[PDB]
Amino acid sequence: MSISISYSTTYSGWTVADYLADWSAYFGDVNHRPGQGVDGSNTGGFNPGPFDGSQYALKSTASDAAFIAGGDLHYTLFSNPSHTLWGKLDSIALGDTLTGGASSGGYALDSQEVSFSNLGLDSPIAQGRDGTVHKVVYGLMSGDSSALQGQIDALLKAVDPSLSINSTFDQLAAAGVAHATPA
């Protein structure tokens, strides 16, 4: 299946790149200092966990910003290659007000701003922190969405070569790859 994007109508006239830069700044680490993948309130984590899940969720330590990575994800912890997030990445949901968990039937964003589905990413454990899945998700807590964008831009062009991360959400809806959600 082709990339599918949901967006709050608030972002209709914004480019994907613009929104991602804004959300990155909201998450609060645009100087790329290394974090350890856990928020200060243990609001996120793996579902079902403890170190593997169909979801990996993380809240910012600087703001209410949060994301949920969806697929079939694995964290190596101290096992070689250490501190690697690998496996299948199907989706990224961005917004704020992270809630839920294993006990709640999954993580959710009370304010889901934008989501990217059918990303079709798979990284094996052997690639360690060089894996695309690791780089894409690590970028979302480390202020650098370039790996996610390489993947979104590539997926958009696979559908239509006139699309890019510089397309507005409304332009992507007109091209059949995005749909608006309530503000």
Could you give the 3-state DSSP secondary structure of residue 180? Answer: strand
- Tell me the C-alpha to C-alpha distance, in Å, between residue 63 and each of 24, 96, 181: 11, 9, 23
Binding residues for heme: 32, 75
Give the whole-angstrom CA distance, residue 85 versus residue 87.
Answer: 7
Q: Are 143 and 108 in contact (CB under 8 A)?
A: no
Binding residues for heme b: 32, 35, 75, 83, 129, 138
Residues 165/15, Cβ–Cβ less than 8 Å: yes
Q: Which string of DSSP letters, residue by residue, matches 12-27?
A: TTSBHHHHHHHHHHHH
For 43, list phi and psi in degrees, rounded to 5.
-70, -40
Method: X-ray
Give the span between the Cα atoms of 11 and 48, in whole angstroms. 32
Binding-site members are 32, 35, 75, 83, 129, 138
Buried b / exposed e over 100-112, threshold 16 CB at 10 Å, is: bbeeeebbbbeeb
